[PDB]
Symmetry: D2
Subunit: 306 residues, 4 copies
């Protein structure tokens, strides 16, 4: 069976917040319907024995602090409630009330120490505040002290040129640009050097890292005093998206084999498309049987048992 490290859920209060604050479709991508039953049924039909639920983007920062704290709490309560309802099928990563540092520090401690979260999920940027920002140092310290799993999830870039790619859904190119920019932001701030105990999961096979690393390697070594290649060995990656036949293969010459995790990205990625993507990973000639076994189960299992 497989363990899904990139699968989502949508609390009712979160769905109401989207309709209330976002005109049209969020990220130029229509909000998908969802119920625990949808995920469970998908797990049954695709031999997934365990899913680590996480709140997707847009992040719940709409400009109202009390609202953001309320949404994050509701979302975490749902995650926790589902973990207690299906202890063998569902687990969850806690969302944080970013950009509110002290409040996020409080959520980290509470979600990890008492509410059974397996770790946390954080937006590449929340209305402009990109992860890696020293505005959240105390949050990093609380996460590092707990050797926590930190899964990044791409959000629409804070700002982009308006007269280009007009109406191109944000997930198609924006998400990748943001994840890439965030990774680099983390290198600039010595994140992996200062918080070596955190286990960072970079989604969608590392976005554009497989191409820019080689291009920034020099600058990063000279100006950031960081070896991008060592970092690529240190972090983790989920493999949601069109990772075949080019993206994953390129990533494997940079990533550590034990650090690759399977992900479906349901329900934002239509269930059928997700099934097809997972079937591709199972039958491709680009992966050995050992690698398929690691990506689908062993890697996640090792990570979770630690």
């Amino acid at each position: 069976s497989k363990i899904d490290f990139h699968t989502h859920y949508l609390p009712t209060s979160y769905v109401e917040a989207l309709k209330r604050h976002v005109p049209g479709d969020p990220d130029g991508w229509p909000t998908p319907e969802w119920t625990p039953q949808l995920t469970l049924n998908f797990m049954r039909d695709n031999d997934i024995s365990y899913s680590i639920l996480s709140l997707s983007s847009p992040h719940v920062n709409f400009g109202d602090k009390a609202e953001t704290i309320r949404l994050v709490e509701a979302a975490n309560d749902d995650g926790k409630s589902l973990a207690q309802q299906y202890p063998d099928q569902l687990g969850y990563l806690a969302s944080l009330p970013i950009p509110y540092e002290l409040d996020a520090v409080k959520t980290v401690q509470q979600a990890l120490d008492q509410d059974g979260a397996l770790g946390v999920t954080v937006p590449t940027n929340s209305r402009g505040l990109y992860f890696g920002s020293p505005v959240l140092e105390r949050v990093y310290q609380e996460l590092d002290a707990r050797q926590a799993i930190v899964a990044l999830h791409p959000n629409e870039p804070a700002i982009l040129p308006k007269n280009v790619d007009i109406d191109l859904p944000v997930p198609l190119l924006g998400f990748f640009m943001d994840t890439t920019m965030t990774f680099i932001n983390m290198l600039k701030y010595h994140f992996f050097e200062k918080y070596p105990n955190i286990k960072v999961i970079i989604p969608h096979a590392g976005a554009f890292l497989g191409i820019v690393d080689d291009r920034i390697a020099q600058y990063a070594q000279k100006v950031y005093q960081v070896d991008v290649y060592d970092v690529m060995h240190h972090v983790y990656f989920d493999v949601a998206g069109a990772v075949l036949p080019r993206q994953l293969p390129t990533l494997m010459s940079l990533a550590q084999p034990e650090h690759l995790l399977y992900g479906s990205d349901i329900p934002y990625t239509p269930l059928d498309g997700s099934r097809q993507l997972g079937h591709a990973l199972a039958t491709t000639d680009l992966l050995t049987n050992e690698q398929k076994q690691a990506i689908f189960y062993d890697n996640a299992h090792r990570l979770l048992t630690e």
Copy 2:
């Protein structure tokens, strides 16, 4: 010997315009010194028998139309003058007075029909106007009627988040994001379908195309009614930059073998670094002798003799 399809020159008026309008280093990258002799000497020391000179970025659109037209003309006159001075070593691609459509139409006709340009070079975006924009249709029509070579050159993206990758030179990540966004912009506007005779050269081994194509293939097929894979076979690519060991190999499963062109990117890329990059292409185990021969000379030669 090799033919360089991505090498630059800097007219004195262009250097004066940069100091006058751009504070600090352009694109967060210090302006390099240059003289024809620098390029010629570099060609001698690296067995390059022919170079196709082109004006790099930033584009010469500073908000003053008459100035832009004056700079573009001066630049083209320099290119032409060098072609007549060293008919066997130097050739040139004309710059255009974008965003001024009718004026650019006039430059295209004049540079190609009477001043010996081998084609044109255009910015991915000129102060926000991204290539592919219907604002320049008449320019495309004049270029298509002449089966012209059109080389894109990345410019700093019109706008980006300000609190991320602070002070990261633009060429390291911005250039790639822009070239990628522009390519997609061209797909949205059916550029290759409407102007099938133009020979578009996409720089730096296609930036991020090797990773996003697979991700947008579906949307592009359904909404743009375009097959991104056919397009990748139709266009050309230069191979300047850290194309090894991941970028070029990925691109070769998408690009046509005869459409890959060598490029050094001097003098913006230090001459020594450029020499090292070219030496890598010559000794790598990732390319057959036939491929090295095609990339370094045959492909460009075929393209130029047409």
Copy 3:
């Protein structure tokens, strides 16, 4: 009776374009319902004998050139058709297919030379191209040759800070910032100096000009070689909006008495609110009866008979 120089209409194709391209309420302001009868009945109920209709913002530039040209033509045909159906009650200002210079040049000649337009209306900025930009020189020349009336209409600023005034409707502060930025842009490019024959109507009592003029006066004189105070005497101003008791009075110490035009801004401003604004201009102690007569009728009439 009064003459209304700032009143709007909404072609059905324009309304369908808004629903199709703009998510939610355009400019954060709900699109109003409209038919020719609503304007006409408003005119009878408010002693308005003549209205010069114009298309409001957002401008019809959605990224599709053919569509922009089609929408503009449909809007001008409607304006023309209304002037022919109600010669004594309705007139109109033609819209222009900006940012397409050559096409706009064509619309100006046609609109003014044969379609009966009383002049043109233009957006302070169309997706980033601000009026005054040399990208439209040929358009200015065609307008100056006809001593045309050019009425600016504010649009949402191209871009603004993301985390401030969240959800504040655009017309409340954005429109003013845009009109203000556009006027200065026109100073910078010597618009009034180069096209003295054009009669420019700046909406909403000059937005912030009443306050910034004194601040930029020096710079404009030294760097633009322009006397802002002379320009304020040269252009025109409609007085739609909350012009009393502060805005209009300030503007009158800078504007010429004969260059002040009445405006209601229906139907974007609720009809009852517009009736109240008009009633206030009629009964205020801040204006002499002569000024009320000039603003409501004489100034417009003189400009129209010219």
Copy 4:
């Protein structure tokens, strides 16, 4: 004698930070030279008996937290050291390490409770975080508990349209747009309602408030549940800049007579230009002798002795 509530100083570390992080002239305005003697000699030559020094913009947030905290501490030590060296001529407002909430909370307590600060000065926005943002609630609470004076100082707007007013110095229009956006932001978050004890000084005669208030009055009442006119009576205003003959007079129909404070804005505004602006306030026919006395001394004095 007069009391100056808008005058600046430049710590050496701040000057070095500007050269190191800002290319060209900050805010498009050349950094002025300064020593304590320049301010003091200006005071003797212009009948100023007391100046409340403050750090001008750009704010010291360059992306490095430790550096921001270090720069703020160096600036406050200088301010404190000047107040101790010239108890009768110089006082100071402390800067805050915004956007670091907890750290700023610390600076407020220390600055006001033991370092002799007369209050604090804050940027309308620090790299995108606009004052009034709930990200700084704890900072407001610490300030309200001390009935602290909080002086806003405009900074370049986070982002603006790229192709308009090209090269127009930021202080000429940008500063005003920012102060204006910030004031409304504060309305939106019920700042004055929640922190009634803070005495907010809005610079440059309220920027554009004199004109927008009447336009947003309705929306602010209905959506923010705030009466903008009551707020205008509640806050304070310095009168640096070209306040005559239009700006200041408009502001006086909204502001409380006792809440108007004199300001020179040296050394950013050339000393001769500031002397002329002060002389104009002294000889203008737009103010009674009582108002001139209040603006120049009484109002400040009453606020300081409180």
